[PDB]
Design a protein around this nucleic acid. Structure first.
Ligand SMILES: [Mg+2]
Ligand SMILES: [Mg+2]
Length: 66
RNA sequence: AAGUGUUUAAGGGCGCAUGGUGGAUGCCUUGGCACUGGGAGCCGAUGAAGGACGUAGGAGGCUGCGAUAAGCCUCGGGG
């Protein structure tokens, strides 16, 4: 739901805030699926990829590639 | 009266006609084998070769991947 272009616009601290937010959303989704009340299975994959994106961007800024 | 003489198949054999079992034969192939012309001839403490355990919305194997886990970013191809 968020693209690498938009992520590169946020400050370092805003990215870390978004990473916590996504981890909380993933946690809620896992519980909803264990309870069997989650209709859209695909939200798990998308949230997980969103976490991976934020990590990638953060690492690029440390390595000086951005 | 004396004499002649067919007439059983419990089961078996042989032939033929129809089947079963079995997977030979013919015709094949996603696999092999032997080589030819090139490439590259090393990988590893910046943790290798090879593995364990994990990883997808649903059990397991093979494949891919590593808690960013059948994937993340960028540059090109493609349609
Ligand atoms: Mg050498
Ligand atoms: Mg492209």
């Amino acid at each position: 739901g968020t693209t690498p272009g938009e992520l590169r616009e946020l400050t370092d601290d805003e990215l870390k805030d978004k990473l916590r937010e996504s981890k909380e959303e993933l946690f809620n989704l896992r519980f909803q699926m264990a309870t069997g009340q989650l209709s859209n299975n695909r939200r798990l994959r998308t949230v997980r990829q969103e976490i991976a994106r934020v990590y990638t961007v953060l690492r690029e800024r440390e390595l000086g590639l951005a």
